Design a protein around this ligand. Structure first.
Ligand SMILES: Nc1c(N2CCc3ccc(CNC(=O)c4nc5sc6c(c5c(=O)[nH]4)CCS(=O)(=O)C6)cc3C2)c(=O)c1=O
Ligand SMILES: [Ca+2]
Ligand SMILES: [Ca+2]
Ligand SMILES: [Zn+2]
Ligand SMILES: [Zn+2]
Length: 163
């Protein structure tokens, strides 16, 4: 469940910055989605995520449309929802979300919190899992639950890299 080449962060204290927002949600709603997404991984590893509002962070977060400078363009409604780069400097670890998607905080397509949590796995060095119940499973499908926490397969994956 590790990204090929075993690329990992050499530090456990990471910073992130939300570069822009989506008009479909309030700023407060986007911030809460991102915060909870990171909290999923933090409670199962030594990783600490610190938000900054200016300057250069380790993980940049932004909403872009079509061609946006990294040679991996988005494609309008549905299809590619977002993507993130493996651990590293520069664009490494950054996560981009397709601005043409309907972003929600409900079970309707597409829940920001869920897509983000998945993307951050890639930002930390995790590959896709073959376990249909894992956050890192290749296919998106929202499941309403009484309590939202990181599945055991994802826990094993994050621990196998950072302990
Ligand atoms: N495939 C593609 C994309 N997505 C990105 C976002 C994304 C997000 C999630 C998945 C697979 N996982 C789920 O659909 C999913 N995982 C979990 S873990 C978990 C839950 C879920 C879940 O509901 N869905 C809910 C209950 S919980 O107690 O909080 C624990 C796959 C994908 C693949 C693209 O973009 C693309 O092209
Ligand atoms: Ca898309
Ligand atoms: Ca970066
Ligand atoms: Zn991109
Ligand atoms: Zn993925």
């Amino acid at each position: 469940m590790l990204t090929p080449g075993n690329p990992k962060w050499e530090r456990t204290n990471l910073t992130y910055r939300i570069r822009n927002y989506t008009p479909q949600l309030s700023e407060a709603e986007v911030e809460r989605a991102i915060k909870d997404a990171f909290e999923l991984w933090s409670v199962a590893s030594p990783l600490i995520f610190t938000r900054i509002s200016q300057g250069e962070a380790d993980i940049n977060i932004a909403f872009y449309q079509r061609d946006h400078g990294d040679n991996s363009p988005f494609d309008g409604p549905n299809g590619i929802l977002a993507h993130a780069f493996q651990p590293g400097q520069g664009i490494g670890g950054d996560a981009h979300f397709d601005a043409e998607e309907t972003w929600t905080n409900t079970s309707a397509n597409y829940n920001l919190f869920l897509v983000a949590a998945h993307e951050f796995g890639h930002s930390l060095g995790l590959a896709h899992s073959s376990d249909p119940g894992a956050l890192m499973y290749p296919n998106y499908a929202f499941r309403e639950t009484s309590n939202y926490s990181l599945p055991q397969d994802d826990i094993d994956g994050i621990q196998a890299i950072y302990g």
